[PDB]
Design a protein around this ligand. Sequence first.
Ligand SMILES: [Mg+2]
Ligand SMILES: [Mg+2]
Ligand SMILES: [Mg+2]
Ligand SMILES: [Mg+2]
Ligand SMILES: [Mg+2]
Ligand SMILES: [Mg+2]
Ligand SMILES: [Mg+2]
Ligand SMILES: [Mg+2]
Ligand SMILES: [Mg+2]
Ligand SMILES: [Mg+2]
Ligand SMILES: [Mg+2]
Ligand SMILES: [Mg+2]
Ligand SMILES: [Mg+2]
Ligand SMILES: [Mg+2]
Ligand SMILES: [Mg+2]
Ligand SMILES: [Mg+2]
Ligand SMILES: [Mg+2]
Ligand SMILES: [Mg+2]
Ligand SMILES: [Mg+2]
Ligand SMILES: [Mg+2]
Ligand SMILES: [Mg+2]
Ligand SMILES: [Mg+2]
Ligand SMILES: [Mg+2]
Ligand SMILES: [Mg+2]
Ligand SMILES: [Mg+2]
Ligand SMILES: [Mg+2]
Ligand SMILES: [Mg+2]
Ligand SMILES: [Mg+2]
Ligand SMILES: [Mg+2]
Ligand SMILES: [Mg+2]
Ligand SMILES: [Mg+2]
Ligand SMILES: [Mg+2]
Ligand SMILES: [Mg+2]
Ligand SMILES: [Mg+2]
Ligand SMILES: [Mg+2]
Ligand SMILES: [Mg+2]
Ligand SMILES: [Mg+2]
Ligand SMILES: [Mg+2]
Ligand SMILES: [Mg+2]
Ligand SMILES: [Mg+2]
Ligand SMILES: [Mg+2]
Ligand SMILES: [Mg+2]
Ligand SMILES: [Mg+2]
Ligand SMILES: [Mg+2]
Ligand SMILES: [Mg+2]
Ligand SMILES: [Mg+2]
Ligand SMILES: [Mg+2]
Ligand SMILES: [Mg+2]
Ligand SMILES: [Mg+2]
Ligand SMILES: [Mg+2]
Ligand SMILES: [Mg+2]
Ligand SMILES: [Zn+2]
Lengths: 60, 23, 17, 83, 206
Amino acid sequence: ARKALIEKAKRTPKFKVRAYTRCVRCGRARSVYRFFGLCRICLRELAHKGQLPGVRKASW
Amino acid sequence: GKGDRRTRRGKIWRGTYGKYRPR
Amino acid sequence: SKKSKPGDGKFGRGVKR
Amino acid sequence: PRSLKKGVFVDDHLLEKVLELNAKGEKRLIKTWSRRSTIVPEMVGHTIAVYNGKQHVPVYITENMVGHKLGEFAPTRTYRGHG
Amino acid sequence: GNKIHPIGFRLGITRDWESRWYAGKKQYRHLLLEDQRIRGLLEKELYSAGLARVDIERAADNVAVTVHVAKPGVVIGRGGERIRVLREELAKLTGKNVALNVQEVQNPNLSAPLVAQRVAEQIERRFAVRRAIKQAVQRVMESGAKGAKVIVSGRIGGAEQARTEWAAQGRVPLHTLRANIDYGFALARTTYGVLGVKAYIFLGEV
RNA sequence: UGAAACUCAAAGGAAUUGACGGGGGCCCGCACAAGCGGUGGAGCAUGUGGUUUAAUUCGAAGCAACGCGAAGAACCUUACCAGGCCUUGACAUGCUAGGGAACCCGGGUGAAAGCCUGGGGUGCCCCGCGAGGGGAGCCCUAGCACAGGUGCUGCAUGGCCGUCGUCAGCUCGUGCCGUGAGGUGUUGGGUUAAGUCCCGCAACGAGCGCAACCCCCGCCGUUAGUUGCCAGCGGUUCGGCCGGGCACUCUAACGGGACUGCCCGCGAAAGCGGGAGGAAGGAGGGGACGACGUCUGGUCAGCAUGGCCCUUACGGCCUGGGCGACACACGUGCUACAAUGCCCACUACAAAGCGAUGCCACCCGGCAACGGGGAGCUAAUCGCAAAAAGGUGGGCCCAGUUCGGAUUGGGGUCUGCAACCCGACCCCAUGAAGCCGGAAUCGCUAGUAAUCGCGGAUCAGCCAUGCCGCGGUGAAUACG
Ligand SMILES: [Mg+2]
Ligand SMILES: [Mg+2]
Ligand SMILES: [Mg+2]
Ligand SMILES: [Mg+2]
Ligand SMILES: [Mg+2]
Ligand SMILES: [Mg+2]
Ligand SMILES: [Mg+2]
Ligand SMILES: [Mg+2]
Ligand SMILES: [Mg+2]
Ligand SMILES: [Mg+2]
Ligand SMILES: [Mg+2]
Ligand SMILES: [Mg+2]
Ligand SMILES: [Mg+2]
Ligand SMILES: [Mg+2]
Ligand SMILES: [Mg+2]
Ligand SMILES: [Mg+2]
Ligand SMILES: [Mg+2]
Ligand SMILES: [Mg+2]
Ligand SMILES: [Mg+2]
Ligand SMILES: [Mg+2]
Ligand SMILES: [Mg+2]
Ligand SMILES: [Mg+2]
Ligand SMILES: [Mg+2]
Ligand SMILES: [Mg+2]
Ligand SMILES: [Mg+2]
Ligand SMILES: [Mg+2]
Ligand SMILES: [Mg+2]
Ligand SMILES: [Mg+2]
Ligand SMILES: [Mg+2]
Ligand SMILES: [Mg+2]
Ligand SMILES: [Mg+2]
Ligand SMILES: [Mg+2]
Ligand SMILES: [Mg+2]
Ligand SMILES: [Mg+2]
Ligand SMILES: [Mg+2]
Ligand SMILES: [Mg+2]
Ligand SMILES: [Mg+2]
Ligand SMILES: [Mg+2]
Ligand SMILES: [Mg+2]
Ligand SMILES: [Mg+2]
Ligand SMILES: [Mg+2]
Ligand SMILES: [Mg+2]
Ligand SMILES: [Mg+2]
Ligand SMILES: [Mg+2]
Ligand SMILES: [Mg+2]
Ligand SMILES: [Mg+2]
Ligand SMILES: [Mg+2]
Ligand SMILES: [Mg+2]
Ligand SMILES: [Mg+2]
Ligand SMILES: [Mg+2]
Ligand SMILES: [Mg+2]
Ligand SMILES: [Zn+2]
């Protein structure tokens, strides 16, 4: 139960309550940020890569 | 005490309003 | 004899579905 | 509980299955999957087979089962205690 | 497993992003997809050129992708015609006016992402892993670098027991932020699983 | 004096590197000691073991699993169960044959999915006063190549993480010692937070670590002066509101500043004790940063991936159920047992963030949740927003209470297709246990512990008492 659910998230559904975020990179259904469209893992992968505009390891 | 929805203290805790903590 | 844990009594296979 | 400003909820597809019976002289044993439907005063005297996730439990309705959903009368877990 | 990404660690210091733009909350993400999808195509199609860094600039309703290829002869093709069929292929994904430069490579033996791919292919082509690492690190230091470290991990030689192999020369101070460490990763598929190849080039400090 | 049967692949010597000692010496860490708050008892929230179940999907396992993956399970999620359904398939590439489409609005059945359906009408280059027939975005019917699998193996793997441990350590090159494993350097005296640094030396250097460069905070400067500020005059419906101004406060970018630099005292030196200047003193406080390695540590369920396995089904769609079960046991928490408190009215003082089917000023209906109207803000401007502990005033009078707020009855509100299983909130009623917790056991050395409130991610709503942050008030103690 993976690819069929990557597709089924994109579909527009019988009711709008059935709409959930999925990671656009890996397809994770959990811990997804709406700002990026990324899960917390992918987020951290592309971040350290520099491929994430103006994102930067905070520290204070 | 904060478990008491029926007072101003309980409402601040659950962060709501009503008769007992109006806004 | 099918999917995932717990086992259904055949090597590798489990009870689900 | 549902806003009484909004409509007392029945799935519509189950309520029509009823009114027809009322009309052409009820009653067949009516089965459904709408646990979420409210017991409506039309329904009294019928028996409704409500799915519990596994089977359709026969439920005979009476004047005093009216406030409730049909799911209140077909429980979903079988227990019978430890021991 | 412990150590932090050497590049992620120096953004704002020794290293620049690979996408430069601002976008409001209402569509930062949409851009981000295009970007990832962009490099998807190019790292897919232009692997054979030896790709090293896709720099994606944005202003508004247009884009400027800059590809950093080792042999730009493969990028531009027979008379501005390859680079064209792709600058056209990019519009079919971008939609916007996809402006595509090709930038020369300084010294390929000083591109950590390149070294990695050269080693990964050698281990993909059944060469001695330990040897290939000592050779790669030689070629870097000769190209006038101040240090180099290459790390192979996986079923080396097909050994059932997975192993870590590495080799390091010069100096590599991953705790020093003024150090300029080009880092790169390559993946190497084989008949018996996958191996990761990490290449560290120390280019001097600031 | 002194065998044999039988049996084993070793039995042994010295020495090396480790690990270990209820061996030694020298050190360090909230390690104990010194203290302050708590856990273990109660009721409840959540995680787990166990049991139960059609299913209660699967993983994490002493420290380093147990409010952990889960930074949002009513449907969705969902990976599980029951049932009803599809079979080149929800999705990718490519090949055929037919319709010849494309796409957008319906209808019958059915819980839906699905099955059966009813319409209209497409370029594209074309021989076109012609009947027209080809070809082509892309749909559909059959038919192949193929897709699909959160099925197994973390003991085949990559990646990333935990952890010993921010501990002071791990090594290399050449030389020298040894038949050799190895040793030397890295040991030794002194010093440091530190293999920090000094002196000594068959060693002399070098690398990974420590420190340093990065970030927040503390003093000062430059640059700026609106949406922020208001020192001193002018108006003023008495609000920096208007004239005006950028001094100040702030905001946010670039610099300065602390160096054991100076004085004394010890000393071979490194440093160490003390003093002065100074906002800050011995690394000023806090963060980011994690050595060679260990644990066949974790994760095939984020992803990647070798191999094994499924093929009208271990795939895919649906409705419903379950993940929320409950004789029980454990963990992490929330709220308390009261007077240094509880309650009502009035009145002060933050910081960091969020916000154009969003934040919602303000007006009205409502005891209220909320509802209707309704300005402003793409936001240093408008809004969330009242901060709460505090301060002032009154009330309670030591009672299972005006302490505590579980449990149950009734009546509503909102989100949402829908709140039976299984949501939050509001009001009337109810008003349990609990009188400070057995053996045991946890945290913290200063703006800390304790106490007080506020924000955000996720998110329709929410079971958040969780988590990541923010500032208010602000101790006790350290002999050793
Ligand atoms: Mg949802
Ligand atoms: Mg999500
Ligand atoms: Mg089981
Ligand atoms: Mg094979
Ligand atoms: Mg011996
Ligand atoms: Mg103690
Ligand atoms: Mg407890
Ligand atoms: Mg308890
Ligand atoms: Mg269990
Ligand atoms: Mg479990
Ligand atoms: Mg598993
Ligand atoms: Mg939750
Ligand atoms: Mg479900
Ligand atoms: Mg392992
Ligand atoms: Mg691993
Ligand atoms: Mg396991
Ligand atoms: Mg050691
Ligand atoms: Mg040597
Ligand atoms: Mg010799
Ligand atoms: Mg040696
Ligand atoms: Mg020495
Ligand atoms: Mg040592
Ligand atoms: Mg040593
Ligand atoms: Mg040694
Ligand atoms: Mg020695
Ligand atoms: Mg230290
Ligand atoms: Mg000025
Ligand atoms: Mg450091
Ligand atoms: Mg294991
Ligand atoms: Mg996998
Ligand atoms: Mg696999
Ligand atoms: Mg399925
Ligand atoms: Mg379902
Ligand atoms: Mg759970
Ligand atoms: Mg207990
Ligand atoms: Mg809790
Ligand atoms: Mg709020
Ligand atoms: Mg009582
Ligand atoms: Mg009693
Ligand atoms: Mg009472
Ligand atoms: Mg009370
Ligand atoms: Mg009720
Ligand atoms: Mg519910
Ligand atoms: Mg008492
Ligand atoms: Mg106590
Ligand atoms: Mg206790
Ligand atoms: Mg300490
Ligand atoms: Mg309190
Ligand atoms: Mg909160
Ligand atoms: Mg929320
Ligand atoms: Mg609940
Ligand atoms: Zn992801």
